[PDB]
Ligand binder design. Structure first.
Ligand SMILES: O=C(c1cnc2[nH]c(=O)[nH]c(=O)c2c1)N1CCCCCC1
Length: 167
């Protein structure tokens, strides 16, 4: 038993809700919140910008130190950093950005990072400003992630669509 409420169960291990991931992290305080990161951990907009602003820019400060030490992530890769006031840890995961021409097949590799964590609160990778089809992203999620994932979808219209079209 865990503290996630209001979710619709999609599969044995995938749950979905219409929620603001920032507000959901603020109330659940999950062990892991997933950020829709880029390779530079520049948290300027989208989920990333929203999560970072909720940390009063502390996420960005930590991220800049990480990059200064380690260099950029790979597309399809991830790193574990602090969750600040939102979660214990933030898993920064880089899905391919279709608006940069990145290969969509890397979306499966991105979701594989979730399997290193027993439970996660997450957005749909490569959705929103990353330009991928959120329905395809949901299919890859279901077919790749084996651990327990609670998907927060900000847009109510999108949500209702994802549910109605789910197989
Ligand atoms: O990007 C935002 C977001 C960020 N900052 C905001 N600041 C404000 O004053 N009003 C807003 O609606 C607002 C929205 N979201 C999408 C990704 C996370 C889910 C919640 C909202």
């Amino acid at each position: 038993v865990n503290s996630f409420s209001g979710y619709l169960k999609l599969t044995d291990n995938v749950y979905i809700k219409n929620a603001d991931i920032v507000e959901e992290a603020k109330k659940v305080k999950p062990t892991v919140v997933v950020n829709a990161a880029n390779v530079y951990l520049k948290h300027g907009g989208g989920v990333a910008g929203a999560l970072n602003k909720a940390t009063n820019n502390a996420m960005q400060v930590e991220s800049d130190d990480y990059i200064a030490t380690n260099g950029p992530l790979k597309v399809g890769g991830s790193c574990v950093l602090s969750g600040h006031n939102l979660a214990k840890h933030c898993l920064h995961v880089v899905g391919p950005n279709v608006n940069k021409g990145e290969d969509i097949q890397l979306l499966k590799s991105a979701y594989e990072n979730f399997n290193q964590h027993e439970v996660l609160l997450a957005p749909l990778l490569s959705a929103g400003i990353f330009g991928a089809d959120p329905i395809h992203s949901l299919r890859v999620c279901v077919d790749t992630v084996r651990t327990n994932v609670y998907l927060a979808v900000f847009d109510k219209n999108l949500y209702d669509k994802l549910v109605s079209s789910f197989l």
